[PDB]
């Protein structure tokens, strides 16, 4: 009886790799266990009871890899981690192939472990050994022993980017997954381009964002081609990040018309695909960003009126979609859309006071439009307080100031209703401030303004 020759280890390699490869397809309670039983039969066939004879070293390294895949098959990886760290110690005492296989095993076990600090420390040590390899002091190859190193480099870099994005670490993780995108398109990419564009939204450089993002669009066009599509939601979030980039560029510009034209084309194609791909919550977000871009995209005086009735038609298309279901989720999104229509009525009232400042106020159709708008906004604020119990510092104070101005300037009734309405607004925020015991931001000067208003409307209508 001699030792294990090359033919026996090659037929064992072929059999084990072929059955594990046809088992990882996942076309069951025993077939995966039959692959694990064959591999533990090889484990018993090992029999452990320059350097030494390299056949034993190669077979122990590949059987440590097979023990690791058996442990990830059985989800009891403690003995697998023990055997692999002993393999790491014996390869330290005992190079390309062994260290890259040990590093892939370490990466997959510390990705299984989900402990952040140990996984990131082991990934930094494998990266340090990678930089040491870049320092640099057979029969049937895949591609010159280079394609295997290429794919495990991309896999290890994507997994360390995942461990880094489990932390905050945004700049270095973003650079690392951009390197994975470059290394992949030189030889999941939609979500990786999505988080690149989201980080660049969090950043300030948008030209490189548009460069890599249009590269993502043209490789979506030239992907080349089953059941799990996900492209609808993926480019839906891409259109979402497109309008968020439009939001931040309009915000930095406001605090020419080519932005209007690109907004027209991109949000038109976006709204077309958003009508294609569902939805309920996505459509709430759609009319949210549509109304918000209609607020931020200001042109002129007479251009404001058509834009206001445009986003009024937008919220009038929002409204009858969520009437039939009505969960408490509808109550929460009803509170958000009442805040949105409150902002829309604030913009409409700025339009109306500009019109009353520059043009004639007591005209018939203008009075009809403003009293219809006042009645609809009173109903909308009635629903907004119906979100509160009829029988956190910023939006409550903003809603109080908005309903205080609504109590103030919209009526020309018998001259006591506006006075009692501003009085109850003052007492409402007095109850708010003795209920919260906290200091406000602008409500103190709007309270002293409403107190002086209480004095002058206590004096002047009586005269």
Numbering used by the authors: 1 to 27, 32 to 53, 84 to 128, 134 to 176, 192 to 241, 248 to 285, 301 to 330, 392 to 527, ...
Paper's wording?
The 3D structure of the ~72 kDa KBP at 4.6 Å resolution was determined using cryo-EM data collected using a Volta phase plate (VPP), and an atomic model was calculated. Our structure revealed that KBP is a right-handed α-solenoid protein. Nine pairs of anti-parallel α-helices (αHP1 [α-helical pair 1] to αHP9) are broken by a single ‘linker α-helix’ (LαH) and ‘linker loop’ (LL) in the centre of the fold separating KBP into N-terminal and C-terminal subdomains. The four predicted TPR motifs contribute exclusively to α-helical pairs in the N-terminal subdomain. The supercoiling α-helical pairs form concave and convex faces linked by short and long loops that constitute the two edges of the α-solenoid. In contrast to the shorter loops, the longer loops (more than seven residues) tend to be partially disordered, show low sequence homology between KBP orthologues in different species, and are mainly found in the N-terminal subdomain (e.g. L2, L6, and L10). The LL is the longest (62 residues) and is thus unique in the KBP structure because it is reasonably conserved and mainly ordered, with visible corresponding density clearly bridging the N- and C-terminal subdomains. Despite this clear ordered density, this loop was not modelled due to low homology to available structures and a lack of consensus in secondary structure prediction. In spite of this lack of consensus, density in this region suggests that part of this loop may form further α-helical structures. The KBP-alone model is incompatible with KIF15_MD6S binding, due to clashes with L14 in the C-terminal subdomain and αHP3a, αHP4a, and L8 in the N-terminal subdomain.
